[PDB]
């Protein structure tokens, strides 16, 4: 997408070389922001083929409050294998924090349900937020949350959402993260009888790994295609009831996929 | 500053009218970002005289892990009065979360000390983060955090910082928050022997209150001047050892102050 490709160019033009924990090396910039008008089309990258089945299943997984890969395995999704333990556990990552953030008084807060209630009864609120950044549990997590904090906003009957991503693997992760959130926005909007607005992406440490340079320039040499369209074939009684098959993406015609290694 | 004035005009030009919780009404936009190169000067607004004194004491108040306005009163700072209880308590706000984030198991994590140690021992870290958004204590707070989440980043010996502000009173709050964080970056850099980089500000619900229109128009008609320069007189033994007397702003020649009512 224009924005995504423009981001890649920026990191290449302004990036600074950094030694990273994975000892792979990154080219990075700090602070960036882009907006996707969800009414223009579903923001799924076309300059390379993306795996929709993996994106959807991960999101349903998060929504279920799950943090074990069994579910992802049942559906042949292996994007999380490298970080799971012998038992398939990732620790209290996304799913747990979203559905059951533990307070100090022994309670657990379901942030998704809370946000849903706000959108329906207090869409004007200035604090419709979900955070995965649980400082007190960070140490039990296989990996600290990358997409860490998100906020919803309503105006003119449209639902917008802004995500703050503390660390971003531009080539590999970003396309996934973007599609995932836009998907969540459509689902929330459908549950609240709202129209979809903008998805705003804000990044902290935004980088390209050293071993993704050729893939990046290959991609950059391509012209984006018309954005695909998302069709939801049903209206479940709750945001927790969606199924993989309720979704249909139409008119997705991307360029060929580009394989790249992930840094552990 | 040009950036500040530009954001002000954008809100008037594109803002949507909202009925806020105070019942005052706001002109609102969602998602915005601005960058301040700290090398170019301290970002203290010049088109309106600002009071560095209340800005400094609040910051120092935070770094002490304090939630009682007592200390602020000791210093003639009255900005938090409307929200304190009969005892002067605000609940586990900023200070408490910065210095003693409570774990579900009874422990506390000191995020400032953590961040100090990260900048010193692992400056390349992609997770040098401080969060005040403790989902489990929001209902105990007198006011949910506005400047909710911040991240530090180091590149070529420079210290940059990004703040995510979920709610922003553009006229009254913003100038204060920008100086506060700029100030913080200068202290961290000094304690960590780094140069100052960029201060990146990202907002969620960014608004102007209805009863701030006159002041806004007045301000929008003034020309910004060169930014001052921040001077630190002594290098304390620790980030928790600074005092009001340690900072000196130099070359600050702002237009006259503008009075505006606070929306409570
Ligand atoms: C973001 C996120 C979720 N996750 C979590 C996740 C976990 C660790 C990470 N680690 C790093 N260094 N970068 C990441 O992007 C990353 C992402 C993903 C993991 C892998 C792929 C990846 O391998 N995609 C490949 C293969 C696609 C497939 O098997 O379906 C692709 O070519 O896109 C995508 C997302
Ligand atoms: C942000 C923040 C911190 N705080 C906390 C705080 C709490 C609630 C708020 N509520 C609203 N609607 N806007 C705010 O900016 C705001 C700020 C502030 C409180 C008020 C002032 C305000 O009175 N500014 C005066 C200062 C004059 C003086 O120094 O005494 C001014 O006219 O500039 C500034 C900051
Ligand atoms: C993480 C997960 C995700 O959903 N998206 C991402 O882009 N990533 C990336 C960010 C970064 O490259 C790395 C995480 O490691 P660290 O804790 O920052 O060392 O995976
Ligand atoms: O440091 C601060 C504190 C508050 N506000 C503003 C944001 C909103 O205008 C309001 C608080 O309302 P809630 O969003 O907390 O309900 O005060 C700021 O800009 N900066």
- Sign of the CA dihedral with B172 first, then B175, B178, and B183 last: negative
- Do A200 and A160 contact (CB within 8 A), yes or no? yes
> If we measure between CA atoms, which residue out of B145, B180, B169 comes closest to residue B11?
B169
The alpha carbon of residue B163 and the mean position of all alpha carbons in its chain are separated, in whole angstroms, by: 8
- Do A126 and B166 contact (CB within 8 A), yes or no? yes
Give the relative orientation of helices B2-14 and B213-220 as an angle to the nearest 10 degrees: 130
Residue B252 vs residues A67, B40, B121: alpha-carbon distances, Å: 53, 14, 36
Catalytic, A192? Answer: no
In angstroms, the CA B142 to CA A245 distance is 45
Number of neighbours of residue A223 by Cβ within 10 angstroms: 9
Q: Report CB contact under 8 Å: A124, B18.
A: yes
Give me ligand 2 centre to Cα A104, in Å.
30
How many residues can be counted in chain A?
264
> If we measure between CA atoms, which residue out of A33, A209, A14, A18 comes closest to residue B155?
A18
Number of neighbours of residue B75 by Cβ within 10 angstroms: 15
* Residue partners of B113: CB distance under 8 A and separation at least 6: none
Structure tokens at B121: 């021992």
In angstroms, the CA A44 to CA A52 distance is 9
What burial class does residue B109 get, using C-beta atoms within 10 Å of its C-beta: 0-12 exposed, 13-18 middle, 19+ buried? middle
In angstroms, the CA B261 to CA B168 distance is 15
In angstroms, the CA A116 to CA A217 distance is 41
CB-ligand 2 contact for B94 (6 Å cutoff): no
Structure tokens at A39: 């009414």
Rg of chain A, C-alpha, whole Å: 18
Which is it for strands A247-250 and A108-109: parallel, antiparallel or unpaired? unpaired
Residues of chain A in contact with residue B17, where contact means CB-CB under 8 angstroms, are none
The alpha carbon of residue A65 and the mean position of all alpha carbons in its chain are separated, in whole angstroms, by: 15
Largest CA distance in chain B: 54
CB-ligand 1 contact for A263 (6 Å cutoff): yes
Residues of chain A in contact with residue B164, where contact means CB-CB under 8 angstroms, are 149, 164, 202
B107, B154, B155, B204: best mutation site toward chain A, by most A Cβ within 10 Å? Answer: B204
3-state per-residue secondary structure call for chain B:
CHHHHHHHHHHHHHCEEECCCCCCCEEEEEEEEEEEEHHHCCCCCCCCCCCHHHHHHHHHHHHCCCCECHHHHHCCCCCCHHHCCCCCECCCCHHHHHHHEECCCCCEECHHHHHHHHHHHCCCCCCEEEECCCHHHHHHCCCCCCEEEEEEEEECCEEEEEEEEEEEECCCCHHHHHHHHHHHHHHHHHHCCCEEEEEEEEEEEEEEEHHHHHHHHHHHCCCCCCCCEEEECCCCCCCCCCCHHHEEEECCCCCCCCCCCCCC
Q: Any bridge partners for residue A162, and if so which? A: A151, A200
3-state per-residue secondary structure call for chain A:
CHHHHHHHHHHHHHCEEECCCCCCCEEEEEEEEEEEECCCCCCCCCCCCCCHHHHHHHHHHHHHCCCECHHHHHCCCCCCHHHCCCCCECCCCHHHHHHHEECCCCCEECHHHHHHHHHHHCCCCCCCEEECCCCCCHHHCCCCCCEEEEEEEEECCEEEEEEEEEEEECCCCHHHHHHHHHHHHHHHHHHCCCEEEEEEEEEEEEEEEHHHHHHHHHHHCCCCCCCCEEEECCCCCCCCCCCHHHEEEECCCCCCCCCCCCCC
Residues of chain A in contact with residue B109, where contact means CB-CB under 8 angstroms, are 135-136
- Do B34 and B49 contact (CB within 8 A), yes or no? no
> If we measure between CA atoms, which residue out of A142, A172, A202, A217 comes closest to residue A24?
A172
Structure tokens at B160: 């940059």
What residues of B are annotated to the active site? 146
Structure tokens at B255: 């237009």
Give the relative orientation of helices B174-191 and B111-121 as an angle to the nearest 10 degrees: 50
In angstroms, the CA A249 to CA A253 distance is 11
Q: Report CB contact under 8 Å: A136, B103.
A: yes
Structure tokens at A72: 């992802």
Q: Any bridge partners for residue B36, and if so which? A: B199
- Do B16 and A155 contact (CB within 8 A), yes or no? yes
Give me ligand 2 centre to Cα B262, in Å.
7
> If we measure between CA atoms, which residue out of B185, B33, B122, B154 comes closest to residue A16?
B154
- Do B47 and B231 contact (CB within 8 A), yes or no? no
Mutational pocket test of ligand 2: of B26, B79, B209, the residue with most ligand atoms within 8 Å of the beta carbon? B79
CA end-to-end distance (rounded Å), chain A? 27
Query: Which residue in the block uniquely carries the two structure tokens 């980030």?
Result: B239
Residues of chain A in contact with residue B129, where contact means CB-CB under 8 angstroms, are 133, 166
Side-chain half-sphere exposure of A64, counting CA atoms within 13 A: 16
Partner residue facing B202 (CB), from A19, A33, A107 = A33
Strand order in the sheet with A26-37: A16-18, A26-37, A195-209, A158-169, A147-155, A129-131
What burial class does residue B49 get, using C-beta atoms within 10 Å of its C-beta: 0-12 exposed, 13-18 middle, 19+ buried? middle
In angstroms, the CA B8 to CA A24 distance is 43
Which is it for strands B158-169 and B195-209: parallel, antiparallel or unpaired? parallel
Give the experimental resolution in Å. 2.2
**Main-chain phi, psi angles of B159, to 5 degrees:** -100, 115
CA-nearest residue of chain B to A200? Answer: B31
Q: For ligand 3, atom 3, which residue shows the shortest CA distance? A: A146
CB pairs under 8 A between A and B: 137
A109, A136, A139: best mutation site toward chain B, by most B Cβ within 10 Å? Answer: A136
Point out the ligand nearest to the CA of residue A49: 1
In angstroms, the CA A215 to CA B54 distance is 51
The alpha carbon of residue B124 and the mean position of all alpha carbons in its chain are separated, in whole angstroms, by: 24
Residue B120 vs residues A4, A111, B85, B158, B186: alpha-carbon distances, Å: 33, 35, 39, 13, 15
Residue A78 vs residues A54, A71, A73, A104, B39: alpha-carbon distances, Å: 8, 10, 7, 34, 46
- Do A29 and A16 contact (CB within 8 A), yes or no? yes
Query: Which residue in the block uniquely carries the two structure tokens 């379901």?
Result: A110
CATH homologous superfamily for the domain A2-264: Thymidylate synthase/dCMP hydroxymethylase domain (3.30.572.10)
* Residue partners of A187: CB distance under 8 A and separation at least 6: A232, A239, A242
In angstroms, the CA A254 to CA A48 distance is 6
> If we measure between CA atoms, which residue out of B33, B7, B104, B178 comes closest to residue A164?
B33
Structure tokens at B84: 């304190």
In angstroms, the CA B160 to CA A18 distance is 15
Structure tokens at B72: 């602020």
Side-chain half-sphere exposure of B220, counting CA atoms within 13 A: 16
Q: Report CB contact under 8 Å: B164, A131.
A: no
> If we measure between CA atoms, which residue out of B235, B244, B150, B147 comes closest to residue B187?
B235
B29, B30, B170: best mutation site toward chain A, by most A Cβ within 10 Å? Answer: B30
């Amino acid at each position: 997408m224009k924005q995504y490709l423009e981001l890649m160019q920026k990191v290449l033009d302004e990036g600074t070389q950094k030694n990273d924990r994975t000892g792979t090396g990154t080219l990075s910039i700090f602070g960036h922001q882009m907006r996707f008008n969800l009414q223009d089309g579903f923001p799924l990258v076309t300059t390379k083929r993306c795996h929709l089945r993996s994106i959807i299943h991960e999101l349903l997984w998060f929504l279920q409050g799950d943090t074990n890969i069994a579910y992802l395995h049942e559906n042949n999704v292996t994007i999380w294998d490298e970080w799971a333990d012998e038992n398939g556990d990732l620790g209290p990552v996304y799913g747990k924090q979203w559905r059951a953030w533990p307070t100090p008084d022994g309670r657990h807060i379901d942030q998704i349900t809370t946000v849903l209630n706000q959108l329906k009864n207090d869409p004007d609120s200035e604090r419709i937020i979900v955070s995965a950044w649980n400082v007190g549990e960070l140490d039990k997590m296989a990996l600290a949350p990358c997409h860490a904090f998100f906020q919803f906003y309503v105006a003119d009957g449209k639902l917008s959402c802004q995500l703050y991503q503390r660390s971003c693997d531009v080539f590999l992760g970003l396309p996934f993260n973007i599609a995932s959130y836009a998907l969540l926005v459509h689902m929330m909007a459908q549950q609240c009888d709202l129209e979809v607005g903008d998805f705003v992406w804000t990044g902290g440490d935004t980088h390209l790994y050293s071993n993704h340079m050729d893939q990046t320039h290959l991609q950059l040499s391509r012209e984006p295609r018309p954005l695909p369209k998302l069709i939801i074939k049903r209206k479940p009684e709750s945001i927790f009831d969606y199924r993989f098959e309720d979704f249909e993406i139409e008119g997705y015609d991307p360029h060929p996929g580009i394989k790249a290694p992930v840094a552990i």
